[model samples]
Target: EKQVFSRMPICEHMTESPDCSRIYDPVCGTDGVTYESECKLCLARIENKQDIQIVKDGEC
Candidate 1:
């Protein structure tokens, strides 16, 4: 007997690499005027203490 398998269509945005760790949602709101990180895998939404330097005052 032989085994058979079916495959599903792949999405252009989909990834299967082990290095893919984080998923970001761009639509998510930031507490202040925060900028996106250069790294694509930092999925944190809320502003961190480090963000204070970049975030403008009264922008929330």
Candidate 2:
């Protein structure tokens, strides 16, 4: 069988309303702060005019 998927995502969607299950998932930000949700991180990046990245998938 031929491969149809790659390790990297083909498309990255940056939307205000991301339909992700709201959980207690915490993610570390580049600014040394833990975000409650990925959506919150996205909002901060948009409002602060900065390029933020997820350092890890847990509270720090």
Candidate 3:
């Protein structure tokens, strides 16, 4: 038998890996700042002390 799996941090700086796609899929965060993509949003949320969430999809 074979097994496939993936590993990720709950919320840490490890998400800073350059592997995140560059595609411009903007998203609005609760901070009112526009994130380049959901990947970046996750990174920002992790780095920020305050609670940040996706308010909506697309630029704010």
Measured by lDDT, the strongest candidate is: 3
Candidate 1 per-residue lDDT, tens place, 1-58, comes to: 1112211111223455553344322221233333333122122322232222222212
Model 3 CA lDDT for position 48? 69
* After superposition, candidate 3 runs with Cα above 4 Å error: 1-18
Candidate 1 TM-score, C-alpha based: 0.18
Model 3: pairs clashing at backbone N, Cα or C within 3 Å: none
lDDT of each: 0.26, 0.59, 0.62
- What TM-score does each of the candidates earn? 0.18, 0.60, 0.60
Ranking by lDDT: 3, 2, 1
Candidate 1 vs 2: which has more lDDT? 2
Off by over 4 Å in 2: 1-21
Q: Return the lDDT, model 1, position 33.
A: 36
